[model samples]
Target: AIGYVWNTLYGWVDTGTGSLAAANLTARMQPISHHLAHPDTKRRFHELVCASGQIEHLTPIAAVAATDADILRAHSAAHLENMKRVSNLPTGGDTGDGITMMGNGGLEIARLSAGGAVELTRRVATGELSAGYALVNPPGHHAPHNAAMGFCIFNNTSVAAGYARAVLGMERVAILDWDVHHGNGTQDIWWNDPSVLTISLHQHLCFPPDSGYSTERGAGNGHGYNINVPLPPGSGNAAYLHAMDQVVLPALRAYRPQLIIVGSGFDASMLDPLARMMVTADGFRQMARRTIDCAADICDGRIVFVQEGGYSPHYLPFCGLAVIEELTGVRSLPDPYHEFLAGMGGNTLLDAERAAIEEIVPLLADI
Candidate 1:
């Protein structure tokens, strides 16, 4: 059976009164009611899962608070300590990066976010569930080994993969991050460890600019274990599918990981304000299908999906619901924006897109 996780706390992450960063009088940055990383967008996705009736087809799992032990598995002790300090602030403040912030006592939600991923991974790895989705928030891919950034508190997927390794005794794990932004934190955490392979498919040089290059492979024994397919702007269904078939799938097969964790994000959707990409609900659905099938063929159907990033509350819910439908084997809903977005392009493989994906094709051999 498929497993699903959602906590009331996941909807309570307090993004302060800023658009993307804190409001600044000098910069004339007006304080908006909704921050770009506001929790409502993710909460809307959860509502759609229920409204679409897709929640009925899956098993519900509860999120547990991650301990310092679990946090240290993927982050430094100093970073964990620092988070505690920030969370205790009078109003909670910036988390290293100027743009990312934590609310007072927000560490509870962060721990729950990371813990949700860990709990889902545990169930999938232990065969309690075939596959599942942890619709977590305070998205994790951008937070690294030392600090949080890009609206993320901790690297949730990395924390989950680390648990699959240490507690579950799994030898190898694969993390596929499809967030529009590069999974810089995840890449950093596992940069020298070959036990976990991190593959990121993202818009080139989007967030945390100048990263996610094909040449940014891992060091030491983990040299070839990291793969980045940085597609150009406007890359859509064709480009993503090609990268998966050519680069991602091959790497997973070569590594033969015991468990596969997907850093699923809808920020790559055409409607997302955070990045420029053309992926639709159908695009995300196809990607989920491909990865889930890949897990079944290679790893006993052991796969877990953790939410990362997605804006556009109106559209993200549909994009996210499509993935839940894929996991539950239910397709009762249609993407409401399909006809409107269909003719806007991104369906065809542009030369630039093909070239970008092809650059990573040869790197598959290193895996």
Candidate 2:
């Protein structure tokens, strides 16, 4: 069965830090706000997918809130305690980093999100399901073990990785993050473990600023395991496909992992208010196809997709539909804006961008 996991409690957690338009910013900066990660993003995507009359091919899995033991797999006791305290507040607040904020009862929702992702990955690892998509909210790739930041409360992907290694008796698991931003938290969690290979492809220096460089590879015993491909800002279909064909696929083959988990963030779309990229819905479809093929080749097609970050409410549905269709082999919905967005800036990988990607191809040999 192709599993689909999501929860309604995610709508209660508010990340809006006031409004950017209230400050009289420019038009390009005006549409951007904390509300960009609002629940409407997923709600509409879910609606569109259902309206396509193809959910019969997909199994809807309910998300269960994680217990302390489950969350402890990827987070510290102190971190969990702090999050519970903050989320219980009546007024609500941020993590002092200006990005990671929480509303009342947000802690419980975050736990459900993380637990739901764990459930999907666990099912996929076993023979219970061939593949699953955990449409979790409050994206988790930017969150670390000790603290929450970048709209993430708990490291869902990290928790899934831990469960795969500790509970499932898997020796090697590969995590591929294709978020527009770097998967810093996942990299840090598996930095020293040789069993988990974490690879991130993101826009260069877009968020967090310091992480996700090719030079900041895994240290100590985990050397050559963590790979970072920082793409240019305007990278589109060709760039992503090239990177998957050249770097990601070969590295996964060399590792020969037991399971594959994707941190599937969709903010790389042309309509997103966040980072700049030119990927359309078809681009995401090709990515899903490529990843699925790679998994089939190496790991018996065991794969889990945990939603991370995608802010464009206008275009997120198209991107998500393309991915879900590819996963289930059922395409019922039409992406009306596919051509419009695909032609926005010409989905071409320039000569300079091609050169930038080539610099990382040689690094894959070490994996």
Candidate 3:
């Protein structure tokens, strides 16, 4: 198994919610990482976080979430207190929000998830780790400064970004969110902070149901700092390439960040269960190439990609595989899903797609 996914999804689920749907959705809201784990996939990327030695070369580090005091830096006291109060309920007790359960371990586990991001930023800034992915579950981009929504309870990426600036002294970090859903919480956290540039590409008007609007540029000093690349439904790999070549890269060029962090999610893959988009693994590899170019242009390739979402069981692994392939360039590993990818020599539509994408670049650049 290729090593990019870190194995942390096993015991993270509390299986007492009666129905599968209830249990699954509940897990999405709590520290229940197993819910965020591979959704019964063929390859089981949840347990394969470090399966690839290619990506393993990047020093792997794990951070346990700090005490409540530390969490308060990014999360409000109410949010922290609510998690504490909720996690102490009985195994089958009402989550105070119907159809959810929170055992005692849920709080600590969510903290661990948030801590992983904090430690990752610290490590990268201190040069302890070149780059690494955080396998945080109950994934945190949707949690606001105080409210927890959209399958997230803590603002992990925001917490990490704050840590990077305040503790690690990383001033110009770019947060590239490729999650299928817009990172409204992330954009809100950095809404007024111009030091960090947040770029989100997601399905417009989809998931959490209200986000990724282009007109909603960040406010205050962060006006131009936030860039939203929303695509219409049915936008597949070619369309994603078009959007990225057109929007994402130019934003990076203009921002000239000190570091690049991808709110990496595999849901855009053609096989995903939630949302519809055909971002193939090979397509992702091409995107990775662009990201690599960003690295070459800005931070000496100092980039960290974090797992956010991608529930497809079959193709998530291959998407991960293709991504690592483009990131590291180690062609020794055999690619299982390398056949029909357009940009990576699987087809020629990549050229036309890339050209169309490139065409939109100057417009965004001009803006």
Top candidate, metric lDDT: 1
The digit string of per-residue lDDT tens for model 2 on 1-367 reads 8999868786566765444212234534453444656778877777777888757789998888888988898888998999988887895677646666687778888999998988998788878999988888878988887888788888898888898899999999999999899999888888888799999999999877988888877989999999999988888988898889989999999999999999999998888788898888898999999999888889989999988888888889889888999999988878898666655763677887788789898888888
Candidate 1 stretches with Cα past 4 Å from truth are none
Candidate 2 local accuracy as lDDT?
0.85
Clashing pairs in 3: 2-51, 2-52, 3-50, 3-51, 3-52, 5-48, 5-49, 6-49
Prediction 3 global C-alpha lDDT: 0.66
Candidate 3: how many backbone clashes? Answer: 8
The C-alpha TM-scores of every prediction are: 0.99, 0.94, 0.82
Candidate 3 regions with alpha-carbon error over 4 angstroms:
1-11, 15-43, 49-58, 92-103, 332-335, 338-367
**What C-alpha lDDT do the candidate models reach, one value each?**
0.93, 0.85, 0.66
Give the winner by TM-score.
Answer: 1
* lDDT (tens digit, per residue) of candidate 1 on 1-367: 9999999999999899999888999999988999998999999999988888888898999999999999999999999999999999999999988988899999999999999999999998889899999999889999989999999999999999999999999999999999999999999999999999999999999998979999989999999989999999989998998888888999999999999999999999999999999999999999999998999899999999999999999999999898888888888689989999999888899999999989998888888
Residue pairs clashing, model 2 = none
TM-score of 2: 0.94
Say which prediction, candidate 1 or candidate 3, comes out ahead on lDDT: 1
Q: Write the per-residue lDDT of candidate 3 for residues 1-367, one digit (tens) a residue.
A: 1113243532354534343234444456333334333234423554343465554554546556656766786777887888787777655233333433444567776677677777776666666655666656656777778766655667777777777777777778888998888888888888887788888888767775767767667778777788777766556766776677668887888787887878888887776767776677767878888887777777866677766777776678677666666655664355565564444332233454444445435435432
